């Protein structure tokens, strides 16, 4: 299904792996997808997060507090966690329901909040961004693009 991801959405997933690698992590979790969506910095997901006051530094701080780093950075392919798999599966359905034939950054963010339970969701809530508020902000921004 990655063939259906936009260029930017693929860049988010590629960057998520390196977010994990550079924190000496050995799985790509939902929190690395969240870091990737912000750090990529251009798409509707990054805009939605920025527009709710969710910054890369806030997320980094919470990841260090909740997860912490390993001792060495791994080489080679880092596997998705079960919850990160579910986020990427759910992104497909968020896109179709919103009338998109491609999976964009915003659909990955919507998948993340649909899954709603993993480390990324915990971080968002701790930083004051309730799941429904995030979804509604994505809808508000997408509505502006219909002008």
């Amino acid at each position: 299904m990655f063939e259906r991801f936009t260029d930017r959405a693929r860049r988010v997933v590629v960057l998520a792996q390196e977010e994990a690698r550079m924190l000496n992590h050995n799985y790509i979790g939902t929190e690395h997808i969240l870091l990737g969506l912000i750090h990529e910095g251009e798409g509707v997901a990054a805009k939605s997060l920025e527009s709710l006051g969710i910054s890369l530094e806030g997320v980094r701080s919470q990841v260090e507090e909740i997860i912490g780093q390993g001792q060495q950075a791994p080489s080679g392919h880092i596997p998705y966690t079960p919850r990160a798999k579910k986020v990427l599966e759910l992104s497909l359905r968020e896109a179709l329901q919103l009338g998109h034939n491609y999976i964009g950054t915003e659909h990955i963010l919507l998948g993340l909040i649909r899954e709603g339970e993993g480390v990324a969701a915990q971080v968002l809530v701790k930083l004051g961004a309730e799941l429904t508020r995030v979804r509604q902000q994505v809808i508000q921004l997408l509505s502006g693009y219909l002008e």
């Binding site: 299904m1 990655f2 693929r10 997933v13 590629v14 998520a16 792996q17 790509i28 392919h77 880092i78 596997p79 998705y80 798999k85 990427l88 599966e89």
Partner: peptide
């Protein structure tokens, strides 16, 4: 799809 980047 769905285990690693980008399978």
């Amino acid at each position: 799809w769905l285990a690693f980047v980008l399978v």
